[PDB]
């Protein structure tokens, strides 16, 4: 029953409306499985990005509780500092009482200024949460507000309406077949093993396995810079004059699927998904980024992947469920 509709912005970002405070002040937030903190802009913020986004006003809420603690969060794209406070967060028809969240003080740079969302609602594990702030979903579960300690995500394609986050439930209308269950390797991000990445029965990357995260907040398929450089040559991407990694739109019809094998099951990504149409030209859905951790350099299975596969995030059993979208 507890669905939260998400707006699809150019197949790059997905965000939904939440209410904070009594009475509710409305904000748009990216529902991000790559991070664990909830924050919104506030009146304490004087950064450029704070001036053109909705700002939380503590004085207007009858249920706001202040702390003396701060938070500092750095993302791949964007960063914030803020102060932690407690209030009621309305999300997915759930009144999430006594929720700790960040009230931004600084949001430096161009990225957050141009972004259509106000904040981020992190959906990963408490262990990666800045200042050890209780994530939203952990607080919902701890208060017995859902019955099933899971949430599932359907992300629409080609700017269509219909993207949803389902709290404490699955909807089998969104997928075909049955869910394939994959164990989380490390409890931080929603981290899994990718057995191999193949094209025409040949391993193009991750020949003996690699570590990947299932990240709703990342647009593209990202990996370490050297394996990605190989994937770019394999799909005929050339580096254009303006910074982009471009492919001829004509070529989509002749390229093979890139197959991600996960727990001995094949998950093909077609060239109509991994080659993106952005602003007249066609671009590679692969991005080179080095994200070093103690399990290796991480791959990100971003929105390119998730659009193809309905994704269930099971906290009861520490597993990810995958099935092809209907
Ligand atoms: C504890 O460890 C850490 O603290 C490190 C410093 N940071 C993190 O873990 C933080 C919380 N998470 C993170 O930083 C993780 C990635 C990550 C995963 C493991 C280790 C390192 C990074 O990214 P998120 O998904 O939360 C973020 C959400 C955005 C802002 C809406 N997305 C990102 O920052 C990614 N940005 C995007 O994909 C943006 N789009 C693009 O840049 C694509 C462009 C339009 C071609 C978004 C507008 C969709 C980049 C990674 C490309």
Swiss-Prot record:
Residues 14-323 form the Peptidase A1 domain. The chain holds residues 63 to 388 of 388 of the full protein. Disulfide bonds join 45-50, 206-210, 249-282. One of its GO terms (molecular function) is aspartic-type endopeptidase activity. Its EC number is 3.4.23.1. Shows particularly broad specificity; although bonds involving phenylalanine and leucine are preferred, many others are also cleaved to some extent. It comes from the Eukaryota. It comes from Homo sapiens. The modification Phosphoserine is found at residue 68. This is Pepsin A-4. The gene is PGA4. It is found in: Secreted. Belongs to the peptidase A1 family.
